[PDB]
Ligand binder design. Structure first.
Ligand SMILES: CCCCCCCCCCCCCCCCCC(=O)OC[C@H](COP(=O)([O-])OCC(O)COP(=O)([O-])OC[C@@H](COC(=O)CCCCCCCCCCCCCCCCC)OC(=O)CCCCCCCCCCCCCCCCC)OC(=O)CCCCCCCCCCCCCCCCC
Ligand SMILES: CCCCCCCCCCCCCCCCCC(=O)OC[C@H](COP(=O)([O-])OCC(O)COP(=O)([O-])OC[C@@H](COC(=O)CCCCCCCCCCCCCCCCC)OC(=O)CCCCCCCCCCCCCCCCC)OC(=O)CCCCCCCCCCCCCCCCC
Ligand SMILES: CCCCCCCCCCCCCCCCCC(=O)OC[C@H](COP(=O)([O-])OCC(O)COP(=O)([O-])OC[C@@H](COC(=O)CCCCCCCCCCCCCCCCC)OC(=O)CCCCCCCCCCCCCCCCC)OC(=O)CCCCCCCCCCCCCCCCC
Ligand SMILES: CCCCCCCCCCCCCCCCCC(=O)OC[C@H](COP(=O)([O-])OCC(O)COP(=O)([O-])OC[C@@H](COC(=O)CCCCCCCCCCCCCCCCC)OC(=O)CCCCCCCCCCCCCCCCC)OC(=O)CCCCCCCCCCCCCCCCC
Ligand code: HEA
Ligand code: HEA
Ligand SMILES: CCCCCCCC/C=C\CCCCCCCC(=O)OC[C@H](COP(=O)(O)OCCN)OC(=O)CCCCCCC/C=C/CCCCCCCC
Ligand SMILES: CCCCCCCC/C=C\CCCCCCCC(=O)O[C@H](COC(=O)CCCCCCC/C=C/CCCCCCCC)COP(=O)(O)OCCN
Ligand code: CUA
Ligand SMILES: [O-][O-]
Ligand SMILES: [Cu+2]
Ligand SMILES: [K+]
Ligand SMILES: [Mg+2]
Lengths: 100, 230, 65, 131, 60, 100, 186, 459, 47
């Protein structure tokens, strides 16, 4: 019975390596001054304004993004021919009444 | 007295195995390849027969030599996976913003981790019995059930996935890394199907090899799970 | 046996049949042909000539031969 | 917002936006060579650039890896698919600088030479306007 | 022994000093290649089998 | 009319006034592939807000041409016209957050 | 190095010592079958390898090379803008990756680049300062060095004030010559 | 029997015999090249058949490396003397030893058969995609050969590593060279297999790794991660032979044995982390280029120590002993030649110098001086040293000063001009060239025809 | 600009950019060191 490695080698070098990686990264961020706040959103300003309008109720709910742009590709032109937001909202309203 | 080593003078499996390999290149039908693979399996078994017959030499270094060979083979398997991880992470900058559906992190990862952990526990119990000079019949059939579920789950996942190898390098790497793991799971089936109780016990290289190999497959999946699913 | 002491005893004791050496040289000669024969075959296939005339793909003087 | 897409004030006032011109440079065949041309190095359309000007070369390869080499300008950049490599140069003297593809690329790797002619800025301006 | 050890020492560090002498020039020339320059003209070069395509900005 | 006005407002402005110079975000690397993709995405978003005819978006296309080879742009512009350009897909129709 | 097994070998405490090495040297050994033989073979290896003076030179080299190797690997992950490990920025289009762009400028101006760029005049003979000026401001304005690079640059004078032609070949003088002709702006 | 033999010494002979046979095809391919490059304009290859030339250079490079030099230095001599240098009787894994040589032959037959049957096109021995993955089936066949060759190399590496378990003597410097070479194969081969599979996937399984949005430079990293260790795997066994020859033929104990051993170990460690000096012109990051350039120069430090230790082995040897033996001359010639090749390697290690010299005949001359002269001469020197033990005859090579002098003069004529051509400049992998490079190319061509004639004199 | 017959051009020839001069000067800077390494070693190749 003779030991070759550290008595707790597996946990030592796994958690220990992870700890050193995490601490090194924080140090690197401080040196370069990188912002550390997390944003999960796209930063397109014009689009975010349109989304706020939908939330405020200025734009009808479930209105597609391609219904709001000044240039449409061919595929979007195909979809605009069959788009009826008013009908979609009524259908959702009917579902809510049935559920309740 | 006697010579330290009982020399092996002649061998003819090498020619047969090498010719079997060539048949793969020179085939004109994929049916020949299927039957050729059976020949390769047969002849490799004969080579394994020679290793068992070498026990008659009573050479203490034979166990050590084979054990270190397996260690080298294990390293090669690890480095092969490293290359796939290398390929996957090289194009990391092109992932997660392409119009493809990446895998969920809730269903597949959890059941596979649970399923493969049970496989490790079964093999661990086999090792414990091998230490105690004891056997339990049911253990082998638990492995077969475990392998059956793994095959059933992976087959459905590939068939129901809505993205294809040609869609993006991300999808190719996902499918390829998962296939490479499956092949190593299938190689485990090839090895475990012959598990039996041998009365010369702890001088049998097969037991230590199986324990090492099964552990390697399971740990590799943890790395895969972290890279792809989580 | 004394005859089996040395590996390749016939050759080492200088009694081997010369045909063994001829086959070795022939095998080497055949290996070399794998670079020359396909060269000739490919040249003819794409040009209709086994070998080019030097600088035949460039403009040549009237008296060039 | 419009300000999210910066544009120089001159163009917002109606100045014409520049356009880009593309041409193809091919080796001159052996049977089409003229008495003074250099075999294996001449091309049908050369690239004219102004001298004593900082120029940015962006080099890529469409199909396979080629390499754009002009030994006199000290440039050897691999034209790899998927990489738009950036090379900067400053030509000090007028002349015509010849080069060859420096990455095996197929049957005619040896038959896609590079010819760059550097002329005075006034000469280049007249040349650019005409072509 | 004393003399021999010095010879072995030189065999190792004389090549090391030469390497150090090259290192500083290597750093400098590498930085020169990647220096940010105020370029005023762009030429786009595309390699194709087997010819070169050049795209230039036409004057207004 | 400020010395540091280029940096102020956006990092984009730096190469808008000096089209043929390095962009601050990609100057560290010789490979400019990512620079071309950012420029093209900017052109796509300009048209959505302002429309193709707007001189601003016309110049944004010119900026893309400064760093994107024409064989790339022709292919990418074809995808944009059809409606399959992953860069120009409207945010509400993206699938990046789906199934993980 | 003692020659008698009776004389003990001095050992320090820690993870790399004589005692630490003895415990592990014979783990895989078939030749160390008894104490006397084991110690003899252990001291034979220690004498041959650790008491060899030139061997320590290679120990230094592997340390230096590995130290650089680990640092460069770590630096790329921590600071290189093009290297991504987190996924927040990769889930957005390029113009929206504001956090990643924060690495660009500082990663473009490492200390050593600033120190060594002024020494371009040790290589270029004509207009070594052709690229020194850049009004954009992504990098500092460069000023040519006043001394040659130490080492193998005996071709040029030790200091540039000793060269009678150094000032005549500067980008400023050449610009003066060509402007006088209307040849070019630079 | 002849094919069933497991004796390691017999198998060692088979490796040497097979390398010579395959060497003829490699020499033929090499001779085709220099004949074509005699002057501008087609000479033996039609302009409409330029594809054949690309195949000639591709096979010349592949055969010489994997099928000729590597089996000769890593399979031939080691299988003969390594179990003898160790106090053991035979190789540890006899049956594996038999199949390894058979595997090498079958892969050779596959390669040459592909020449005859498939359309002849080439992509270089480095098989850079996308060119390699848009080719015809000959590229598929060449991949099978490499993968098959990889199997033989790895199992042979496993065989040598097992000597550590059974060695009953001292680990001599030569044994260390083979062991460390095996270690390099074990760590580098699996990476090579992985990337080669990706090449097959694109060729045969509709994979898209090497099309737009897939970085082609990815292949170069993985390939050269094995590529450079390969060149060090070729040369390290040559270093072991030189150490034995110099010590034996001078009756001098090897000086600084441990320094020699540590130098070999150091080279392998450094050789595994400097692969990207093959990728200077692709446009890597500034810091990345500086790192590889700095570490590449460091490889000279251990390599230099070995050179000096060799020199002191020859210095001071007794004058009475005859010094004209071919084995001794070749061993001494190696030091002179290797220094030339290594110094030029350091020149092209500086990346800015490399910008001008990449893909030029300067690089060709660099690795020919090391491999075509140094490695061949080391292999020749080792075989000559073991002539009595091996027992071959019917050649005049043991004491032949004409052969040594003529070989040295003429090989230098072939490759010294190629350094000059590199600055002129002439690209590599090129059939036609400008008229003003003819003089130097003509001189090298005269050198090539002369060398072939000299080989006929040994018989 | 273009290759010329029977020219050594050791280290390069005919630079036209400041970077081209740098390439030639770098090779010339190291060339004498290379000679020193070769001469010093070769002089001692003897009995
Ligand atoms: C009033 C009755 C109430 C019954 C309640 C139900 C109980 C069922 C228990 C089933 C446990 C199966 C565990 C499988 C793992 C392997 C076990 C093992 O090692 O066996 C060794 C054992 C002996 O091996 P050995 O090598 O000879 O000896 C090794 C040791 O030395 C010595 O080994 P050992 O003796 O230590 O073994 C200990 C133990 C080790 O394992 C355990 O202890 C694990 C226990 C897990 C409990 C799982 C319960 C599942 C129930 C779910 C129900 C869900 C309902 C949902 C409703 C939804 C409504 C909307 O193993 C066993 O005892 C295995 C079961 C033996 C039965 C064999 C005969 C055939 C099956 C008979 C089933 C009868 C069911 C009647 C139901 C009546 C209800 C009123 O193996 C065998 O006997 C041979 C193979 C067969 C064994 C597996 C049989 C599976 C039967 C499943 C029945 C339940 C189905 C539920 C379906 C629900 C669908 C919705
Ligand atoms: C790099 C170059 C320069 C190198 C310089 C440096 C060199 C330094 C020295 C290196 C020395 C290394 C160590 C040497 C150790 C030697 C030990 C030794 O001798 O072992 C004994 C060993 C065997 O001796 P043994 O123990 O008496 O063996 C008895 C037999 O086992 C049993 O006796 P058996 O009579 O019963 O034998 C059976 C015999 C039965 O024999 C017969 O029945 C013979 C019948 C006559 C056939 C003759 C050939 C006919 C060809 C016709 C061609 C027609 C073409 C028509 C074209 C028409 C065009 C329009 O054969 C067979 O049944 C099977 C034969 C299979 C092998 C031969 C294959 C030939 C090529 C086939 C090509 C096929 C191509 C198909 C392609 C199709 C593609 C679609 O010796 C040999 O095998 C010969 C070795 C000779 C060399 C020794 C070394 C001398 C030093 C080197 C000299 C320079 C060589 C340069 C290379 C060659 C240049 C060309
Ligand atoms: C915070 C983290 C902290 C972590 C802490 C971790 C702590 C770990 C503790 C480890 C302790 C190890 C204890 C065992 C020592 C070795 C004993 C031994 O082997 O017994 C012989 C034993 C046989 O028993 P025996 O009968 O006693 O042998 C008698 C001798 O044969 C008869 O020979 P002799 O009597 O004439 O001479 C005796 C001796 C003569 O040799 C020696 O005594 C050598 C002594 C030095 C060994 C190295 C020690 C470490 C040095 C410091 C390195 C630090 C690097 C730091 C980097 C940091 C970067 C961040 O012979 C041997 O040692 C033969 C085996 C040599 C194998 C070498 C394989 C290549 C490895 C590279 C060489 C080492 C280079 C070091 C660096 C050099 C530059 C400064 O060997 C075997 O069982 C052979 C098995 C072969 C298996 C091969 C396949 C394995 C899988 C390969 C995968 C790929 C490997 C890649 C390697 C890459 C290399 C570059
Ligand atoms: C579930 C589904 C089930 C499905 C079921 C379906 C079943 C399917 C079955 C599939 C498997 C079929 C094959 C089974 C093999 C069985 C093996 C076995 O047990 O054998 C016992 C059997 C024992 O024989 P025996 O009945 O007691 O009689 C033996 C004699 O009495 C005396 O005993 P010996 O052993 O001394 O005599 C043998 C030897 C004795 O003769 C000699 O050795 C002659 C003396 C030597 C002369 C010098 C040769 C050159 C130096 C070579 C140095 C390296 C040697 C490496 C080691 C040998 C490698 C072969 O002669 C030969 O056998 C020929 C030797 C050939 C040497 C080749 C050396 C390199 C040639 C380079 C060529 C360069 C030109 C390039 C172009 C051409 C490329 C092909 O083995 C043998 O001795 C015969 C083996 C014959 C099979 C060889 C097959 C080779 C295939 C190569 C690939 C070809 C594909 C492409 C074609 C391209 C054509 C152009
Ligand atoms: C056996 C084969 C072999 C060996 C040993 C080497 C050894 C070395 N090689 Fe080589 N190399 C090749 C085979 C080999 N190479 C091949 C085949 C290619 C081309 C592949 C292809 O593109 O197809 C190549 C290409 C190649 C390139 C260019 C790659 C490219 O861009 O295409 C470079 C660049 O630095 C290089 C460097 C080196 C160095 C620095 C060494 C060092 O090991 C040399 C060190 C030795 C010395 C320096 C001399 C001895 C020491 C002294 C005398 C004292 C100390 C000296 C100094 C400090 C200067 N090699
Ligand atoms: C071991 C490897 C090896 C060897 C020996 C040689 C030997 C020779 N090579 Fe080379 N060569 C390469 C490996 C080798 N080569 C590689 C890897 C390339 C790059 C491939 C590519 O472009 O992709 C190359 C490229 C290459 C080119 C460039 C092709 C091109 O780019 O267009 C040329 C041109 O002349 C050339 C010529 C020669 C010549 C004239 C000889 C010889 O004639 C020199 C003198 C040698 C002899 C006269 C024969 C001596 C005998 C033997 C070598 C066999 C001995 C066998 C035993 C001892 C068992 N080689
Ligand atoms: C390869 C991707 C795999 C993703 C795996 C996900 C699971 C994470 C846990 C296991 C892996 C360890 C990494 C954990 C990182 C935790 C902190 C973190 O997020 O770090 C991110 C940060 C960078 O991310 P971005 O901010 O997007 O980039 C900024 C500009 N570059 O990552 C890092 O810097 C750490 C990544 C590297 C960690 C590993 C250690 C690095 C050094 C290796 C040296 C190797 C040489 C030999 C060493 C010898 C040591 C004895
Ligand atoms: C249970 C056993 C597990 C063992 C696992 C082993 C894993 C590693 C196996 C070897 C593979 C290494 C990974 C491959 C690394 C490639 C990195 C790479 O190519 O990156 C370079 C940059 O890389 C570097 O800077 C080079 C660092 C060198 C990495 C070497 C890692 C492997 C070294 C193995 C050497 C052998 C082992 C030595 C052990 C210690 C010896 C004392 C590319 O940079 P750019 O293209 O410019 O891109 C930068 C941003 N756009
Ligand atoms: Cu293009 Cu070569
Ligand atoms: O490869 O050097
Ligand atoms: Cu290399
Ligand atoms: K020609
Ligand atoms: Mg190249």
């Amino acid at each position: 019975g003779r030991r070759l490695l550290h008595g707790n080698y597996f946990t030592r070098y796994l958690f220990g390596s992870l700890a050193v990686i995490w601490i090194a990264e924080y140090a690197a961020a401080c040196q370069y001054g990188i912002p550390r706040h997390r944003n999960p959103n796209w930063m397109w300003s014009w689009w975010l304004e349109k989304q706020n309008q939908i939330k405020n109720g200025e734009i009808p709910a479930n209105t597609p993004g391609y219904a709001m742009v000044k240039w449409n590709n061919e595929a979007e032109q195909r979809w605009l021919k069959t788009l009826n937001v008013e009908a979609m909202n009524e259908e959702f309203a009917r579902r809510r009444e049935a559920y309740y | 007295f006697e010579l330290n080593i009982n020399i092996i003078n002649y061998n003819y499996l090498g020619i047969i195995i090498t010719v079997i390999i060539s048949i793969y290149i020179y085939n004109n039908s994929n049916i020949i390849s299927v039957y050729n693979s059976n020949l390769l399996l047969i002849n490799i078994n004969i080579w394994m027969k020679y290793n068992i017959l070498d026990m008659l030499n009573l050479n203490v270094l034979d166990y050590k030599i084979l054990l270190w060979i397996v260690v080298i083979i294990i390293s090669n398997e690890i480095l092969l996976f490293v290359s796939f991880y290398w390929i996957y992470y090289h194009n990391y900058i092109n992932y997660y913003h392409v119009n493809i559906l990446i895998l969920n992190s809730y269903n597949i990862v959890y059941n596979n981790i649970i399923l493969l952990t049970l496989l490790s526990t079964i093999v661990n119990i086999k090792f414990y019995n091998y230490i105690l000079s004891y056997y339990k019949y049911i253990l082998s059939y638990l492995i077969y059930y475990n392998n059956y579920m793994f095959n059933n789950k992976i087959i459905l996942e590939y068939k129901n996935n809505s993205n294809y190898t040609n869609d993006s390098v991300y999808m190719t790497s996902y499918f390829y890394i998962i296939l490479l793991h499956y092949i190593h799971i299938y190689d485990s089936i090839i090895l475990i199907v012959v598990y039996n109780y041998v009365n010369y016990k702890n001088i049998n290289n097969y037991y230590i090899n199986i324990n090492i190999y099964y552990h390697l497959i399971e740990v590799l999946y943890i790395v895969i799970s972290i890279l792809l699913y989580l | 046996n004394l005859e089996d002491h040395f590996d390749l005893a016939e050759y080492m004791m200088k009694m081997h049949n010369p045909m063994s050496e001829y086959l070795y040289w022939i095998a080497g000669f055949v290996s070399g042909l794998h670079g020359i024969l396909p060269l000739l075959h490919s040249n003819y296939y794409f040009s209709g000539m086994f070998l080019p005339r030097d600088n035949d793909n460039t403009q040549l003087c009237d008296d060039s031969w | 917002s419009p300000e999210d897409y910066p544009t120089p004030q001159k163009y917002l006032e109606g100045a014409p936006i520049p356009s880009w011109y593309s041409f193809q440079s091919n080796l001159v065949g052996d049977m089409d060579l003229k008495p003074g041309m250099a075999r294996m190095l001449e091309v049908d359309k050369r690239l004219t650039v102004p001298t004593r000007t900082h120029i940015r070369f962006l080099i890529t390869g469409a199909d396979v890896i080629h390499s754009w080499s002009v030994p006199s300008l000290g440039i050897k950049c691999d034209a790899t698919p998927g990489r738009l490599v950036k090379i900067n140069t400053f030509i000090q003297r007028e002349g015509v600088f010849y080069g060859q593809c420096s990455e095996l690329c197929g049957t005619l790797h040896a038959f896609m030479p590079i010819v760059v002619e550097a002329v005075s800025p006034e000469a280049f301006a007249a040349h650019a306007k005409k072509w | 022994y004393n003399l021999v050890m010095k010879v072995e020492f030189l065999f190792f560090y004389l090549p090391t000093i030469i390497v150090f002498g090259i290192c500083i020039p290597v750093y400098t020339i590498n930085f020169a290649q990647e220096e940010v320059i105020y370029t005023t003209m762009t030429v786009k070069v595309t390699g194709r089998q087997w010819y070169w395509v050049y795209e230039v900005e036409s004057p207004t | 009319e400020s010395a540091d006005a280029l940096f102020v407002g956006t990092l984009d402005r730096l190469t808008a006034e000096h089209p043929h110079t390095d962009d601050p975000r990609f100057a560290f690397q010789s490979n400019q592939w990512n620079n071309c993709e950012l420029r093209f995405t900017q052109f796509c978003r300009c048209t959505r807000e302002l429309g193709e005819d707007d001189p601003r978006c016309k110049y944004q296309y010119y900026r893309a041409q400064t760093v994107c080879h024409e064989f790339l742009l022709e292919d990418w512009m074809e995808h944009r016209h059809r409606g399959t350009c992953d860069l120009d897909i409207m945010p509400d129709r993206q699938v990046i957050h789906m199934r993980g | 190095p003692p020659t008698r097994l009776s004389t003990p070998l001095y050992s320090e405490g820690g993870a790399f010592t004589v005692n630490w090495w003895r415990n592990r040297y014979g783990l895989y050994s078939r030749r160390q079958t008894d104490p006397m033989l084991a110690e003899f073979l252990f001291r034979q290896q220690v004498k041959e390898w650790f008491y060899d003076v030139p061997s320590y030179n290679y120990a230094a080299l592997v340390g230096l090379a590995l130290g650089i190797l680990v640092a460069v690997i770590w630096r790329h992950f921590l600071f290189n803008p093009d290297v991504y490990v987190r996924r927040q920025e990769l889930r957005k289009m390029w113009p929206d990756r504001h956090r990643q762009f924060a690495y660009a400028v500082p990663y473009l101006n490492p200390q050593l680049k600033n120190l060594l760029l002024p020494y371009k005049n040790s290589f270029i003979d004509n207009e070594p300062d052709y690229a020194d000026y850049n009004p954009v401001g992504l990098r500092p304005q460069r000023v040519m060095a006043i001394r040659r690079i130490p080492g193998f640059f005996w071709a040029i004078p030790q200091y540039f004030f000793e060269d009678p032609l150094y000032t005549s070949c500067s980008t400023k003088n050449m610009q003066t010559i060509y402007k006088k002709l209307g040849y070019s702006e630079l | 029997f002849y094919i069933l033999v497991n004796n390691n010494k017999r198998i060692g002979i088979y490796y040497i015999k097979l390398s010579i046979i395959i060497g003829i095809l490699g020499i033929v391919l090499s001779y085709i090249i220099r004949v074509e490059l005699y002057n501008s304009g087609n000479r033996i290859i039609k302009y409409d058949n330029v594809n054949y030339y690309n195949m000639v250079i591709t096979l010349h490079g592949l055969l010489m490396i994997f099928y000729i030099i590597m089996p000769g230095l890593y399979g031939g001599i080691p299988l003969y003397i390594l179990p003898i240098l160790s106090v053991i009787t035979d190789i540890v894994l006899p049956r594996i030893n038999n199949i390894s040589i058979i595997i090498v032959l079958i892969s050779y037959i596959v390669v040459i058969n592909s020449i005859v049957i498939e359309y002849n096109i080439g992509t270089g021995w480095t098989l850079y995609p996308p060119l390699s993955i848009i080719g015809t089936v000959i590229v598929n066949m060449i991949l099978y050969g490499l993968i098959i060759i990889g199997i033989s190399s790895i199992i042979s590496a496993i065989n040598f590593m097992n000597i550590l378990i059974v060695i009953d003597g001292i680990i001599y410097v030569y044994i260390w060279s083979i062991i460390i070479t095996s270690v390099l194969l074990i760590i580098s081969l699996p990476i090579l297999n992985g990337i080669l599979l990706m090449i097959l996937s694109d060729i045969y399984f509709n994979s898209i790794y090497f099309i737009l949005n897939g970085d082609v430079v990815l292949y170069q990293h993985l390939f050269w991660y094995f590529g450079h260790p390969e060149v060090y795997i070729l040369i390290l066994p040559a270093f072991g032979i030189i150490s034995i020859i110099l010590s034996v033929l001078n009756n001098k104990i090897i000086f600084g044995m441990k320094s020699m051993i540590l130098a070999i170990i150091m080279i392998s460690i450094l050789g595994s982390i400097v692969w990207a000096h093959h990728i200077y012109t692709v446009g890597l990051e500034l810091d990345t280029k500086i790192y590889f350039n700095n570490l590449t120069l460091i490889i000279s430090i251990p390599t230099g120590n070995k050179i000096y230790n060799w020199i002191i082995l020859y210095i001071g040897s007794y004058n009475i002993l005859y010094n004209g033996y071919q084995s001794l001359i070749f061993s001494i010639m190696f030091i002179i030649i290797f220094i030339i090749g290594g110094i030029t390697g350091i020149i092209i290690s500086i990346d800015i110098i490399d910008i001008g010299l990449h893909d030029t005949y300067y690089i060709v001359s660099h690795f020919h001086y090391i491999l075509s002269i140094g490695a061949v001469i080391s292999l020749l020197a080792g075989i000559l040293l073991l002539k009595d033990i091996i027992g071959y005859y019917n050649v005049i090579i043991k004491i032949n000063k004409y052969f040594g002098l003529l070989l040295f003069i003429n090989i230098n004529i072939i490759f010294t001009p190629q350094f000059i051509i590199g600055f002129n400049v002439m690209p590599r992998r090129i059939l036609e060239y400008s008229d003003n490079i003819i003089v130097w190319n003509l001189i090298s061509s005269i050198g090539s025809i002369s060398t072939i004639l000299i080989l006929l004199s040994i018989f | 600009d273009i290759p010329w017959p029977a020219r050594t051009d050791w280290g390069g020839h005919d630079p036209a950019t400041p970077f081209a001069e740098l390439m030639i000067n770098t090779h010339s800077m190291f060339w004498p060191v290379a000679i020193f390494i070769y001469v010093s070693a070769i002089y001692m190749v003897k009995k």
